[PDB]
Design an enzyme around this catalytic site. Structure first.
Site, PDB file in Angstrom:
ATOM      1  N   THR G   1       0.857  -1.217   0.000  1.00  0.00           N
ATOM      2  CA  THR G   1       0.000   0.000   0.000  1.00  0.00           C
ATOM      3  C   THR G   1       0.874   1.241   0.000  1.00  0.00           C
ATOM      4  OG1 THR G   1      -0.160   0.073   2.424  1.00  0.00           O
ATOM      5  CG2 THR G   1      -1.832  -1.188   1.244  1.00  0.00           C
ATOM      6  N   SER G   2       0.260   2.400   0.216  1.00  0.00           N
ATOM      7  CA  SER G   2       0.994   3.651   0.349  1.00  0.00           C
ATOM      8  C   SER G   2       0.117   4.644   1.089  1.00  0.00           C
ATOM      9  CB  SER G   2       1.398   4.200  -1.019  1.00  0.00           C
ATOM     10  OG  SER G   2       1.843   5.536  -0.914  1.00  0.00           O
TER      11      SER G   2
END
EC number: 3.4.25.1
Lengths: 194, 233, 204, 121, 212, 220, 196, 222, 196, 194
Positions: G1-2
């Site tokens: 993810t980020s």
């Protein structure tokens, strides 16, 4: 798996179990775990299923080839030295021979019996009495107590009866008795009333 | 015995009434890192064959070298190397299938899945698949890797059986391929927005379209999604 | 290693025209060794029959459990448990031990005493209700029975014709399974009577 | 290694090297063997020598077969050693001592192979 | 699998089952587990079917070559050692074998040599191999005699395999009887264990625990 | 297994195939994979068949009791919370992958719950082995403001993609349509594209073909 | 993810991509990874989805129970509640959290709670698989007390590169702006940030 | 680590008749839970009225069939276009299979044909090269689903004459080619229902004195 | 580590840090990771030190042998020689290489040879453990045909962040500038780049 | 490890090996692997070293406690059902009893002998003749051949001699003979001349 050998004053007595077990059942109860390397040299063997007889018959061919070539019988010391070398070569080979042998012979030039114990690694040792595997766990205490160098063949056989009886009493596996052979100045003979 | 390091994602293809179409994205992934974006994974071999390769890029560049050697070794002492003795898709595939299986039997596989798409000299479409294990098969639609699970369901609606090939035109086949690439970009994590598309037609020949772009994507419904359940604002 | 394959055995249930059939093999063994040729795997709790395959200890344990449970059910309810209700009783009981499960596949068979329609239901080892209108199979030879039952079975077989179909499906499936055989028993369950038959089959 | 064809056909069909090998035999000390109803007698002719250790002509190949020869003495030891190894190999592989016919075919085969191999006389 | 071979006054009786199983799935019911190496030598398949079939078929060629060269029929001792030596070369490579090289020769008489994948080679009067071997021993050890007639010996071999077929899950199908004599081996037919069991049960009264 | 949920302009539709497999064998050719949690909250489960049936049956019981306690129509959110908290408590050992959809006084809802207790909201979802094949159809054809008919066709078409392209999915299509203003309609076997063909021969045995040892009458 | 969180002059901005992947497959491409644990306290979730969702539910329950009894909590208190769950169950819950919140006295605050369960107060925080590719970019470009417009432009540039280089990151960019004016939600689609 | 073996599913079935032999197999090709192709020929005519099919790992099945067809070609070259007997072909395949004993062809193969006296012959091979002639043999994933049904309908196992109380077995009669195809079709139709790896079509190659005849029948595609 | 190569207007610049670590310990903090395989062809080495040093020695031997027979090689040829060794022994040699060189016809060229053994021609290349932290920064800031001064400033900013965030990267920054003017070696110490 | 049981017309004959082996040697050669649960119920057991006797003595206490409590002897069917339940409870417990038992008894109310074979899983089955472990591999072929329901105790003992002789011949392990006990209408007695 039982392989016993006792050297007495005038002869060597080799005893080996008669049973052959493959997995769940006993295939044979009259097997002879010995090979006559020379008229006065006998070899008992034990170990992995196929290695024992393949090795023993391969050794017997070379000792026979030497005897015919020089028209001379190798001494038991030389045969044991030759057998030890083959086991030493194999223990560090692609497929080692997992065979433990007893070499009993009569040295016609020194006029003395000789018993050599060699394990699958190639550990040759001359003993008054020998055994391979767990067969020596039950018998050495008796042999250490009763053995004397000057026994006659009859006393030596009486001592093997005690050693075999102890194996029958305490060792779990049923080895179906023993075949006893005597290496004397007259050659190799089998004791049938044992 | 090896493992893949830098890999190309799914190649998808299908045969239509007059030829075949094969597409692949221009990405080389190094793990989850989308590292290399200029990788061309469609390898034209003459005027009637295109070899699409997926999986390990290092082995892809080895296969690409073998194919250029076929075209050279075929032209040796062969005055008809351009007309009647040129390399057919079937000859190219059999060479690759043999190489892929021979490497497998040595336990030194080429960690690739290859689709050889082309048109035979007699006009028959050719579309065959081969992977690192040497397994080969043919179908009206072929997809490698992640596209077998998502592209094949879409391409198979257009050409579900052999009888559907003659009723499928270039435009219908092309939009099906282009839509499948968009679906792969949606749901494939190791996929790129840029892709190459090759059309091999028995009449117009090979048409190789580079730097095609995934377009007309749908995201406007994302604004209405809030939290993972109970959340309201 | 697999508890369900230690003892072998197979059970098959079929539906006919206002009749049900449930059959099983009589072999109990310890892997290769056949121990008993009289180990029945079909038990009845009134007019509802339960065939349990799998580990022989779990088959015996569940029989006494469902006898315990169905006996208490008839005392409180004052009526026998119907096949549909019993199917959920078996399902819940098997799930109550999701993490200590019995390695058994049961097969419920019976005729609802009120509606009178045949009923058969199958299960996994943790109680998934596999209610089928045609046939149910269980045991080591489920693969053989599925193909054997799927070909021979046809809807609305009479009780006499159902016996030939289920018995033939059982015998031929058992003949191709190493751990199943040593005789088979077939129950032909009708609204008014039940017939129990022992089949002649290979004893090897 | 060395593989020249030493034994080749003469323009008249004769393999001279093999014929010249026969001349070596005719120059060697003579051996004679006669067999009766129950035994075979092998006799030999001897050309400050020590009788104890000078090799005897009649060599046992196995406990039941004896091989006498004539010709180049050094070559005989090569055949006899090969014969002895084969006789023991036959027992080790088939558990039966070689028949005299079998041993002669092996020894003859070895001699023949040397008339058709390269680099050997 | 259940294969037995025992020596008696009339030669050798070789009886084998015919069931091959892939797990619990009985792949075949009519496998030929006796390999007819020659008109005079019989093999026996146990363990690796391919290893037994291939190498005992190869062994026949070696026996034939010995015939052509020596102009005499190969002994059973030599035939079993040719196979035993080869099986040993591949020891540890994955071969699986348990076989009896049954043969009858003028100079050697009736001979059974048990050769297995370990390289073992045993001469004996009675051998049983396979999963049901312990059941075959039970019948043989009690009813076996050297002075058995050919008819009684054939039944004993047939009965011994039936006992193993009944109790062993991986044994059954049919009993293949072979009789090795002075002029070669004789095939005494294929007997279905299913039919034989009921026939044996009525005539002997045995298997009293089986209803029927 | 193939399961899909498709939210449309006035409700939500969930569809599933009806094949149940024990490895490569088809144990049940017409398994019902759509389960009620309440009259207008329905669940479709992939993965282990027993856990999906059992977990929904437990939550369905609690939803009914909670509905009777609060005298209110169940929220789809209540089912999601009790369902995910139950799955999380068992740390993923309950291998139930579920799509829970329904309508409550607060609108139409569509969630997916994974075996480990994670949940996600979505306008179209899919689970099972055929999820990728079904999601290809949902991605291609889904659009905002679907009507009830378009959604049912899209949901069935998505299930068909899994049926034809996935080995673990097949037989029939089950559809349940939950619309905000009216009752949930369970369209059992909405489409039956895999009806078996007639057999080449009839295998009716002649009576007396089977050998019998003894016959008995069993007392009931 | 980020996931990302940046304090700015008027408050704090939480941001994240929308992609969740199970291997190469994108299970959901429009996920909402910004979770409201209190009115002006929001958290970003990275790592195991089941664990982070369970923790966020429990933290929300605790802060709701806190508010009824002890008044509105501060962002430090919310991070403290996160720490106890993440730390006391660090062997089971593989959860990395970024907690950002707003209160009048302290303005915007950001707390990162990495996999170990420790708590660190930061001016800006980045986490997730895609964050590793923008450590250099964010450090060189982040400034104290930027305006809302500059922070949004900064965040768009940062995540566009995290999305660009990470396979497990992508989709739309979802932002939550916490300030005195209230909570504002922003969404940026690939056609907006991809060609920055 | 690299696994050099796969499993493409499918099923094959060889049945030997009095003057014919049929070798049937489904044309589906699979990988895991995905369908690779719906028409991949699995049974091949190898010449000399021999039909061969290798089931299991497709790469080895293709390689073995490719190598056997090559062996037949050299047999004709070496033996002056002599027709390869079915038993000679069966023995030759054993050496192809056992030539890779320690890296086997992970395939169960069946070859069908007519023996030298004109009777249908079917040989089945173990992956490492054991062959034994049989009247009928199914191989592959759904062998257990198909084979028990053919024992009952071809060999009339467990079937007795009505009214004899099991004393008289049903006599084994001659099944024509047409009747065997009905049994083959119903066997594969049944396996298609209950096995996920079987379907999409059925390829039957009939070997007879006239030559090899090919028939194709559709199966369920789900 | 952290190795980098950037083509620019007048040629190509190779750069790397100086730290080599065996675990947490810095075995050598002043290592020279720029290797000369030919007069105007240089390579950066990442991964196993033994494998990369062996490959560089063999490649230098091959290009030296090539030059004596076939004239000066091009950077493409040097990368080809690298690929054969890295690819034909990919199961043994864990080596990732960046090959940059200069020739009059093609100006500066950069070839990256990642762990798999494939070859990719790039305008700029970054590798090593510390490169992951500057993927976003380099992409946003790299420009075609920069001057030498801009490229050096760009590289200093890039590696300073790679050194900042990577424990296994640090030390001095060593650059090699390959142009028509010849080979030029530059060194930047922490006191010069650390406070950029 | 040998545990044999044969039910004849009027009595049940249970035979069990006398040997006790712990690792390398035979500790005892006169062990009795049986417990009298009731005046007409006897239980033979085999299995792991300590589990066999701990379980057998625990079962015997409960059967004795029942007999004293109701002043009534449990039938062999009830005892076997009770014993099976405990084995079934244990097989899925913290430390299962790995014990295989034969329960031979005389039902004084049905006036019929009863033999029950229960393995450590809890698999109770009534047989005319039973055996546990590999002891049944060698003996079932003989019992299937010679057993008849109407044998007398003397014929049953003669049949056990054949079964034991076969075990001695083919089984590799030496089990030091068997102790034979007969459960009859008159109670339990031991045969000493066997």
């Amino acid at each position: 798996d039982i392989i016993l050998g006792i050297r007495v004053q005038d002869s060597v007595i080799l005893a080996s179990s008669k049973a052959v077990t493959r997995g769940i059942s006993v295939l044979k109860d009259s097997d002879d775990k010995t090979r006559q390397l020379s008229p006065h040299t006998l070899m008992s063997f034990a170990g992995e299923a196929g290695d024992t007889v393949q090795f023993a018959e391969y050794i017997q061919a070379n000792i026979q080839l030497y005897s015919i070539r020089e028209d001379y019988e190798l001494s038991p010391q030389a045969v044991s030295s030759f057998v030890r070398q083959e086991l030493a070569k194999s223990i560090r080979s692609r497929r080692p021979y997992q065979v433990n042998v007893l070499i009993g012979g009569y040295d016609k030039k020194k006029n003395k019996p000789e018993l050599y114990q060699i394990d699958y690694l190639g550990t040759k040792v001359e003993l008054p009495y020998g055994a391979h595997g767990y067969s020596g766990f039950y018998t050495f205490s008796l042999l250490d107590h009763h053995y004397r160098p000057d026994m006659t063949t009859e006393e030596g056989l009486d001592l093997l009866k005690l050693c075999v009886q102890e194996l029958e009493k305490r060792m779990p596996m049923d080895f179906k008795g023993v075949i006893v052979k005597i290496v004397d100045k007259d050659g190799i003979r089998q004791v049938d009333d044992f | 015995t090896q493992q893949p390091i830098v890999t190309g994602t799914s190649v998808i293809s299908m045969k239509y009434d007059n030829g075949v179409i094969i597409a692949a994205d221009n990405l080389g992934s190094y793990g989850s890192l989308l590292r290399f974006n200029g990788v061309e994974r469609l390898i034209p071999v003459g005027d009637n064959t295109v070899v699409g390769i997926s999986g390990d890029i290092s082995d892809m560049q080895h296969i690409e070298r073998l194919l250029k050697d076929l075209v050279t070794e075929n032209a040796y002492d062969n005055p008809l190397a351009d007309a009647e003795e040129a390399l057919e898709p079937s000859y190219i595939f059999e060479y690759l299938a043999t190489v892929m299986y021979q490497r497998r039997s040595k336990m030194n596989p080429l960690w690739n899945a290859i689709i050889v798409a082309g048109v035979q000299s007699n006009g028959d479409q050719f579309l065959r698949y081969v992977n690192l294990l040497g397994v080969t098969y043919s179908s009206p639609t072929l997809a490698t890797g992640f596209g077998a699970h998502m592209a094949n369901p879409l391409l198979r609606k257009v050409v579900d059986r052999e009888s559907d090939i003659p009723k499928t035109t270039v435009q219908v086949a092309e939009e099906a391929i282009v839509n499948a690439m968009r679906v792969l970009y949606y749901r494939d994590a190791r996929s790129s927005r840029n892709f190459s598309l090759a059309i091999i037609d028995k009449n117009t020949g090979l048409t190789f379209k580079k730097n095609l772009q995934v377009e007309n994507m749908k995201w406007d419904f994302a604004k209405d999604i809030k939290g993972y359940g109970t959340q309201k604002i | 290693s697999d508890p369900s394959s230690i003892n072998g055995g197979i059970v098959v249930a079929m539906t006919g025209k206002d009749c049900v059939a449930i059959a099983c093999d009589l072999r109990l063994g310890s892997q290769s060794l056949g121990v008993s040729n009289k180990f029945e795997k079909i038990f009845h709790y009134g007019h509802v029959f339960l065939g349990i395959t799998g580990l022989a200890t779990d088959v015996t344990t569940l029989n006494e459990m469902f006898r315990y449970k169905t006996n208490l059910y008839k005392l409180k309810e004052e009526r026998a448990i119907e096949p549909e209700t019993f199917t959920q009783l078996v399902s819940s009981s098997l799930y109550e031990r999701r993490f200590g499960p019995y390695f058994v596949g049961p097969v419920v068979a019976g005729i609802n005493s009120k509606s009178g329609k045949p009923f058969i239901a199958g299960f996994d080892l943790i109680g998934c209700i596999d209610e089928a209108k045609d046939f149910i199979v269980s045991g080591t030879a489920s693969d053989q029975l599925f193909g054997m039952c799927e070909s021979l079975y046809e809807p609305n077989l009479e009780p006499e014709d159902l016996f030939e179909t289920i018995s033939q499906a059982l015998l031929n499936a058992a003949d191709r399974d190493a751990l199943s055989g040593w005789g088979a028993v077939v129950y032909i369950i009708k609204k008014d009577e039940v017939v129990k038959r022992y089949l002649k089959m290979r004893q090897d | 290694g060395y593989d020249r064809a030493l034994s080749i056909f003469s323009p008249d069909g004769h393999i001279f090297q093999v014929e010249y090998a026969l001349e070596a035999v005719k120059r060697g000390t003579c051996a004679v063997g006669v067999k009766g109803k129950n035994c075979v007698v092998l006799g030999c002719e001897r050309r400050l020598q020590d009788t104890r250790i000078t090799p005897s002509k009649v060599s046992k190949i196995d406990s039941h077969v004896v091989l006498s020869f004539s010709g180049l003495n050094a070559d005989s030891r090569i055949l006899i050693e090969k014969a002895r190894v084969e006789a023991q190999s036959h027992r080790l592989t088939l558990e039966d001592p070689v028949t005299v016919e079998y041993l002669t075919r092996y020894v003859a085969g070895v001699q023949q192979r040397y008339t058709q191999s390269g680099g050997v006389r | 699998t259940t294969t037995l071979a025992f020596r008696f006054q009339g030669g050798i009786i070789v009886a084998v089952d015919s069931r091959a199983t892939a797990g619990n799935w009985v792949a075949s019911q009519t496998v030929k587990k006796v390999i007819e190496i020659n008109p005079f030598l019989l093999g026996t398949m146990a363990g690796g079917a391919a290893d037994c079939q291939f190498w005992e078929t190869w062994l026949g060629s070696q026996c034939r070559l010995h015939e052509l060269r020596e102009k005499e029929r190969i002994s059973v001792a030599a035939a079993s050692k040719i196979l035993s030596n080869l099986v040993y070369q591949y020891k540890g490579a994955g071969l699986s074998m348990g076989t009896m090289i049954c043969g009858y020769t003028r100079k050697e008489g009736p001979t059974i040599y048990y050769v297995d994948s370990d390289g073992t080679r045993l001469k004996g009067d009675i051998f049983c191999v396979g999963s049901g071997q312990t059941f075959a021993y039970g019948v043989l050890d009690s009813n076996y005699k050297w002075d058995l007639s050919v008819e009684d010996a054939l039944y004993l071999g047939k009965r011994s395999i039936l006992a193993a077929a009944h109790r062993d899950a991986y044994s059954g199908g049919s009993v293949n009887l072979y009789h090795v004599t002075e002029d070669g081996w004789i095939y005494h037919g294929n007997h279905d264990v299913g039919e034989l069991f009921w026939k044996v049960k009525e005539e002997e009264g045995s298997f009293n625990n089986v209803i029927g | 297994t193939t399961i899909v949920g498709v939210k449309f302009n006035n409700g939500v539709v969930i569809a599933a195939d009806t094949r149940s497999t024990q490895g490569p064998i088809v144990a049940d050719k017409n398994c019902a994979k759509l389960h009620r949690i309440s009259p207008k909250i329905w669940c479709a489960g992939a993965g282990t068949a027993a856990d999906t049936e059992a977990v929904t049956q437990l939550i369905g019981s609690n939803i009914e009791l909670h509905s009777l306690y609060t005298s209110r129509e169940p929220r789809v959110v209540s089912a999601l919370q009790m369902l995910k908290q139950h799955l999380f408590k068992y740390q993923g050992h309950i291998g139930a992958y579920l799509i829970v959809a329904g309508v409550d006084p607060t609108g139409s809802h569509l969630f997916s719950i994974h075996a480990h207790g994670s949940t996600d909201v979505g306008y179209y979802l899919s689970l099972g082995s055929g999820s990728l094949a079904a999601m290809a159809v949902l991605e291609s054809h889904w659009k905002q403001d679907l009507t009830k008919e378009e959604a049912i066709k899209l949901a069935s078409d998505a299930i068909q993609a899994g049926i034809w392209n996935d080995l673990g999915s097949g037989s029939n299509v089950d559809v349940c349509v939950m619309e905000i203003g009216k009752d949930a309609e369970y369209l059992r076997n909405y489409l039956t594209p895999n009806v078996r063909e007639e057999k080449q021969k009839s295998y009716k045995f002649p009576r007396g073909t089977t050998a019998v040892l003894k016959e008995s009458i069993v007392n009931i | 993810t980020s996931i990302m969180a940046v304090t700015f002059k008027d408050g704090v901005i939480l941001d994240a991509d929308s992609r969740t992947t199970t291997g190469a497959y994108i299970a959901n491409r429009v996920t909402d990874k910004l979770t409201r644990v209190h009115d002006k306290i929001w958290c970003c979730r990275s790592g195991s989805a089941a664990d982070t969702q369970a923790i966020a539910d429990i933290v929300q329950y605790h802060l709701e129970l806190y508010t009824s009894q002890y008044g509105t909590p501060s962002t430090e208190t919310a991070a403290s509640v996160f720490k106890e769950l993440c730390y006391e169950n660090k062997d089971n819950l593989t959860a990395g959290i970024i907690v950002a919140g707003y209160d009048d006295k302290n303005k915007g605050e950001v707390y990162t709670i990495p996999l170990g369960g420790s708590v660190h107060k930061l001016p800006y925080a980045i986490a997730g698989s895609g964050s590793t590719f923008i450590y250099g970019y964010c450090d060189k470009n982040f400034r104290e007390n930027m305006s809302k417009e500059e922070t949004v432009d900064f965040i768009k540039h940062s995540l566009s590169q995290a999305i660009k280089w990470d396979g497990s990151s992508g989709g739309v960019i979802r932002m939550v702006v916490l300030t005195a004016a209230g909570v504002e939600r922003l969404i940026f689609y690939p056609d907006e940030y991809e060609q920055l | 680590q690299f696994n050099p073996y796969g499993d493409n599913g499918g099923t094959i079935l060889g049945i030997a008749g009095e003057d014919f032999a049929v070798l049937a197999g489904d044309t589906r090709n699979i990988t895991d839970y995905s369908i690779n192709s719906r028409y991949e020929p699995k049974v091949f005519d190898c010449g000399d009225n021999i039909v061969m099919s290798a089931n299991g790992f497709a790469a080895d099945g293709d390689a073995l069939v490719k190598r056997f067809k090559n062996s037949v070609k050299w047999y004709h070259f070496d033996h002056n276009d002599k027709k390869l007997s079915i038993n000679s072909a069966a023995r030759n395949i054993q050496h192809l299979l056992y030539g890779k004993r320690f890296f086997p062809y992970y395939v169960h193969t069946i070859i069908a044909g007519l023996d030298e006296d004109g009777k249908g012959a079917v040989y089945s091979f173990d992956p490492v090269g054991s062959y034994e002639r049989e009247q009928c043999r199914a191989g592959g994933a759904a062998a257990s689903l198909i084979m028990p049904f053919l024992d009952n309908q071809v060999n009339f196992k467990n079937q007795y004459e009505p009214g004899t109380n099991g004393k008289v077995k049903k006599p084994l009669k001659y099944l024509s080619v047409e009747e065997v195809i009905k049994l083959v079709r119903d066997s594969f139709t049944s396996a298609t229902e209950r096995h996920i790896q079987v379907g999409d079509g059925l390829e039957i190659l009939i070997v007879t004195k006239d030559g090899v005849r090919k028939e194709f029948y559709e199966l369920k595609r789900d």
